[PDB]
Design a binder for this molecule. Structure first.
Ligand code: NAG
Ligand code: NAG
Ligand code: NAG
Ligand code: MAN
Ligand code: ALF
Ligand code: MG
Lengths: 816, 324
């Protein structure tokens, strides 16, 4: 629809030559990051607390919730900042590289951004094309340059590119002398091959031959020229409109099942917080009813507080209980879950088993948010030509489908090919075993619509349920399947569809032949909806497999021979199909277990933290008095118990990674989001409720002694909360040291180093930390708590009483 | 080609504890043989600890301390005679307990000015606003501001041993050495400069309830104000509503005699502290101290119940594997 004028000799609408791949700009980084972080639940909930603390008068200082929050928002920025300062530096080199330009018979070298639409560009040997050019002429005879598309479509052949036949005569000679050319080009389309050109270069009299220039003359952006002294083009697309910049297509598939359970636990742990605060308020005013239970003459209210409206105190007392118990929601979870995904998705691209000596390329991570979705896959949607058969099967495209059937998945082969060329080769693909009864709904047997409604019925109501992995494999086509989804809204008594969803759930092998690219996204969408959420994967290599690669729960694009269209819209990309084994079975199983045990432990180690502070309210006058110091309510989540679970989630193989690919037999089947169901959830909740009652009521019975030392000196409430904190830090740390079945030299450094820091800190925070404080409330509280033989014995015991129900499982899990 | 290092390939050298019955069952026996011999040496140590308490709050019309239970003429003297069946052997520690006294109430715990008691010459004449209802009076700042320092335990306990004749032997009690050494020598200091103390505490008034200012709490310059041990011991809060604080300590005699020989004693209290109102009790507690502290059976009983359940479970757990 547009028209280009090269020589400025006539007979806006289009943009400039600048590509942006970043998300933030230095002007608007802070307002655009801080908004998208404080839009999450546990980030907004901790800001509502921090505001409530600075206005209302609350038990705890605002530092206890503004230092861990500012430290967690800052680290989650520095990450997303540098992770985006790349896109600058990644494209800064691409649109700041020098290119020569002939403005008007003047050959100047500008920068790649200063390039405007419709001007002469000269590219000598071995320089990427600054913009989507149209090769008006080349300098050598016959005007042919050899440019390989090493980056655009992954091919590595020296594709030929001819100059405009009519104007190969133009050889570098003063291109302003009445070089009027009317290039009526069409608007951009990302086809990367289809392009209709139209040259109307006016001669002295007339010349308008419609040379439909295309893939032979369109020199694409970012493709390096090879073995040509220099070329002469003109830009008809200048970035964000060129074919190279029309294939980004970034969108939000990233929503794992372990990231929508984190939200189900926050919704639970927030009702535990509204109950701990509503119980302790109802009890605060039942207790306060006795006139000597408020202002009992030793602590007497002040005139201001003794005259506040009772209806308002009942509200401020409620906020002071939400603020006191506000730690029951983990602050440092969001930064740890996403610092683990970033640093963790490197093992999927560093892996030497995802390396092809032919392509000479590895794996690829386009999104680091579905890592745990590789170990939850329930269905697999493949593509016959290209993934299972190269351009006969591929290297190991038959033994992988065994490993995908042993692991309990269901492989569906959505091919855009015929049936006999697909099925009769699927007899070799080895998804269809020899003694597999095949139930075929192909057109060559269903040449009648209503028979199919009987076919659906007779092979189901009298066949499929009146008599199965190695047993049945369904075979469909593109046509008979269309009627089952397109027009299935006529009879609601027994639909075509609701009956088709009964065999698609139990049939482990399915082969849909002659499927248009728009049905591959239907079948994934139909399967994604039935009976909960079968987590579907889709792996393909062509450009017709971009609908289902964008549709499914995770999309694995194969770096094939057709192009990088499926490999760049996908989430992870592997240069083979046989790499599906090591990806799901060894990497997906390890990625899920590492984060499903970091999620459970993050909610556990916080309920053990607050339950001894909720119980203390019964032995305080329900007066919201923090059991622990201030320097312990902040540091606990960010300092004392932060690294041991992070190092765990990065280096921890609860089944040796070599016995995981060797054995799929059950290993993948063990976790269908098992580690986060209701079963294991209220094993960690009722283990943290047991360990919280033990920490308090072992220090409660210990303090009936009148002295715990040999010189007969008594302890306070800071040597009471320190004994509960010492037992609490050592339990939740030695609870992880009981769960690691893979002790690296780092799991020794962060676990035994987090226990020795809490001991070094507590002996240091009890020295010269005076001048800037108004408390000195924990001066020698640690160093005296340890000078008593009876307190070492309690701590050693209460740690073991608390870790007993966990040792009791280990034994009952070894045995039988 | 990717860097074939140990770390990047997820094949770091690790340990991977293989848990076998030959390695997980003995656990239930290497504790049951360790927790029970400790739970018996503690239970035996917490039994040989001779202690005796006396509740002298009144509240019983037959108690000798019922005459000053009532708001009456203030210097009441009530005497309660107890009796030790077995003599007290080592050095003995006299406490005082209080019940229904929430020294851990939030409005109470925060009601001190630690920079004042630490000897800030700036904070001495302008105490904090946390210690609020007791921060000032008559346009003058309270010397030890606060509710913690206002309500200080102020009745005097004395012991008298009745000898072979009818006359009482006065048992000598010691005041020094009852506060943590740290928060008597470091955390609690006097105001900065001055030969006598009454001048340092110049522009300040005694707390509302005290009868004598801080600089009149004693005679020797080592116990006078902000240093007084009975004051330092009262400040360190309770952690529970029912607590007790060290009052005096009785030094063992260099002879071969017991510290507190058996007989009939006298505890003649100068009852001052009114706890009749908030329904609290007041006790005196004499006790002997061992390496583990005072008399508390929880440690012995808990070590046994855990050392005797791990040995039972190891037996049921050894019944299964060894027979199967
Ligand atoms: C009666 C009462 O509640 N407490 C009193 C207090 O008012 C008084 O100022 C103080 C004098 O030492 O003795 C005590
Ligand atoms: C002792 O202190 C109590 C509580 O502060 C007070 O009621 C009483 O009058 C005092 N008696 C004295 C100072 O003799
Ligand atoms: C000790 O108690 C007895 C009881 O009569 C009596 O001597 C007096 O109350 C106390 N001692 C003093 C102060 O003399
Ligand atoms: O108990 C009341 C009584 O307390 C003390 C002093 O404050 C007196 O002025 C007051 O009369
Ligand atoms: F094998 Al296809 F589209 F059916 F790549
Ligand atoms: Mg293909």
């Amino acid at each position: 629809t547009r028209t280009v004028f090269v020589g400025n000799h006539p007979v806006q609408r289009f943009c400039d030559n600048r590509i942006v791949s970043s998300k933030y700009t230095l002007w608007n980084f802070l307002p655009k990051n801080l908004f998208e972080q404080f839009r999450r639940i546990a980030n907004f909930y901790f800001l509502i607390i921090f505001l409530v603390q600075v206005t209302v008068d609350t038990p705890t200082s605002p530092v206890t919730s503004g230092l861990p929050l500012f430290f967690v928002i800052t680290v989650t920025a520095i990450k997303q900042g540098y992770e985006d300062w790349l896109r600058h530096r990644a494209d800064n080199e691409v649109n700041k590289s020098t290119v020569y330009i002939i403005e008007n018979a003047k050959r100047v070298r500008k920068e790649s951004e200063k390039i405007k639409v419709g001007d002469v560009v000269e590219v000598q040997a071995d320089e990427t094309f600054p913009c989507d050019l149209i090769l008006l002429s080349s300098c050598t005879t016959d005007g042919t340059c050899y440019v390989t598309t090493a980056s655009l479509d992954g091919e590595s052949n020296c594709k030929t590119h001819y100059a405009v036949r009519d104007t190969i005569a133009l050889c570098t000679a003063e291109s302003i002398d009445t070089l009027r050319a009317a290039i009526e080009c069409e608007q951009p389309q990302p086809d990367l091959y289809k392009f209709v050109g139209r040259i109307n270069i006016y001669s002295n009299s007339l010349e308008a031959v419609a040379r439909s220039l295309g893939p032979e003359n369109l020199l694409l952006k970012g493709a390096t020229l090879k073995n040509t002294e220099k070329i002469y083009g003109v830009a008809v697309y200048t970035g964000m409109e060129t074919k190279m910049a029309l294939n980004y297509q970034g969108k939000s598939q990233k929503r794992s099942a372990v990231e929508k359970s984190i939200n189900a636990f926050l919704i639970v742990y927030l009702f535990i917080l509204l109950t701990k605060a509503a119980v302790c308020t109802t009890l605060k005013y039942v207790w306060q009813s006795t006139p000597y239970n408020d202002e009992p003459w030793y602590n007497q209210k002040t005139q201001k507080e003794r005259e506040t409206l009772k209806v308002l105190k009942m509200f401020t007392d409620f906020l002071s209980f939400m603020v006191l118990f506000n730690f029951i929601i983990p602050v440092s979870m969001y930064v740890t879950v996403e610092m683990q995904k970033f640093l963790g998705s490197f093992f999927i691209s560093w892996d030497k088993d995802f390396y092809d000596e032919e392509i000479n390329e590895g794996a690829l991570v386009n999104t680091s948010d579905l890592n745990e979705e590789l170990g939850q896959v329930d269905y697999v949607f493949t593509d016959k030509t290209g993934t299972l058969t190269e351009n006969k099967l591929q290297d190991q495209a038959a033994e992988t489908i065994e490993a995908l059937h042993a692991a309990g998945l269901k492989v569906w082969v959505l091919t855009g090919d015929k049936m006999e060329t697909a099925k009769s080769t699927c007899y070799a693909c080895r998804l269809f075993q020899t003694n597999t009864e095949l139930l075929e709904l192909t057109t060559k047997t269903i040449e009648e619509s209503e028979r199919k409604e009987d076919r659906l019925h007779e092979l189901l109501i009298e066949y499929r349920k009146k008599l199965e992995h190695q047993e049945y494999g369904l075979i469909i086509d593109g046509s008979t399947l269309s009627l089952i989804l397109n027009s299935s809204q006529d009879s609601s008594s027994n639909n075509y569809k609701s009956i088709f969803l009964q065999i698609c759930m139990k049939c482990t092998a399915v082969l849909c032949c002659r499927m248009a690219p728009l049905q591959k996204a239907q079948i994934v969408r139909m399967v994604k909806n039935l009976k909960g959420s079968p987590i579907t994967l889709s792996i393909g290599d062509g450009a017709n497999d971009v609908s289902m690669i964008l549709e499914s729960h995770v999309g694995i694009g194969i770096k094939g021979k057709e192009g990088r269209q499926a490999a760049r819209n996908s989430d992870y990309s592997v240069p083979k199909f046989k790499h599906l084994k090591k990806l799901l079975l060894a990497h997906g199983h390890l990625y899920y277990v590492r984060i499903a045990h970091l999620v459970q432990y993050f909610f556990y180690k916080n309920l053990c933290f607050i339950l001894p502070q909720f119980l203390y309210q019964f032995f305080c006058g329900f007066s919201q008095q923090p059991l622990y110091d201030a320097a312990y309510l902040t540091m606990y989540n960010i300092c004392f118990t932060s690294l041991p679970i992070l190092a765990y989630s990065l280096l921890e193989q609860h089944i040796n990674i070599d016995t995981l690919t060797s054995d799929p037999r059950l290993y993948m089947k063990i976790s269908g989001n098992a580690m986060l169901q209701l079963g294991p959830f209220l094993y960690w909740t009722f283990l943290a409720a047991f360990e919280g009652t033990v920490f308090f009521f072992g220090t409660y019975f210990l303090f009936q002694t009148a002295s715990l030392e040999e010189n007969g000196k008594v302890y306070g409430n800071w040597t009471f909360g320190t004994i509960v904190f010492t037992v609490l830090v050592f339990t939740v740390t030695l609870k992880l040291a009981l769960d690691t079945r893979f002790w690296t030299w780092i799991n020794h450094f962060v676990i035994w180093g987090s226990l020795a820091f809490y001991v070094f800190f507590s002996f240091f925070w009890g020295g010269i930390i005076w001048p800037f404080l108004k408390q000195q409330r924990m001066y020698f509280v640690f160093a005296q708590m340890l000078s008593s033989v009876s307190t070492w014995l309690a701590i050693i015991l209460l740690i073991f009483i608390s870790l007993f129900p966990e040792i009791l499982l280990i034994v009952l899990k070894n045995v039988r | 080609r990717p860097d074939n290092t140990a770390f990047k390939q997820q094949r770091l050298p690790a340990w991977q504890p293989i848990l076998t019955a030959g390695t997980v069952l003995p656990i239930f026996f290497i504790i049951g043989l360790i927790f029970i011999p400790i739970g018996i040496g503690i239970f035996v140590t917490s039994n040989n600890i001779r202690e005796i308490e006396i509740d002298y709050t009144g509240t019983e019309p037959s108690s000798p301390c019922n005459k000053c239970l009532s708001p009456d003429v203030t210097p009441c003297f009530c005497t309660i005679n107890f009796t030790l069946e077995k003599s007290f052997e080592g050095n003995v520690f006299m406490y005082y307990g209080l019940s229904n006294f929430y020294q851990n109430h939030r409005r109470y715990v925060k009601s001190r000015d630690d920079s004042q008691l630490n000897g800030d010459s700036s904070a001495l004449l302008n105490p904090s606003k946390e210690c609020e209802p007791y921060r000032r009076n008559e346009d003058k700042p309270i010397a030890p501001c606060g509710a913690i320092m206002n309500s200080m335990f102020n009745d005097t306990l004395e012991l008298f041993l009745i000898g072979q004749d009818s006359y009482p032997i006065p048992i000598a009690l010691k005041k020094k050495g009852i506060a943590w050494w740290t928060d008597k020598n470091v955390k609690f200091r006097n105001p900065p400069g001055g030969d006598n103390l009454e001048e340092r505490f110049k522009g300040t008034t005694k707390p509302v309830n005290w009868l004598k200012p801080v600089y009149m709490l004693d005679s020797d310059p080592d116990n006078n104000g902000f240093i007084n041990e009975d004051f330092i011991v009262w400040m360190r809060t309770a952690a529970l509503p029912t607590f007790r604080k060290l009052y005096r300590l009785i030094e063992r005699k260099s002879d071969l005699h017991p510290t507190l020989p058996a007989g009939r004693y006298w505890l003649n209290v100068t009852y001052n502290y009114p706890v009749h109102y908030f329904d609290g009790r007041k006790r005196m507690i004499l006790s002997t101290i061992s390496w583990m502290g005072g008399k508390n059976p929880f440690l012995g009983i808990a070590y046994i119940a855990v050392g005797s359940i791990s040995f039972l479970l190891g037996v049921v757990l050894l019944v299964i594997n060894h027979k199967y």
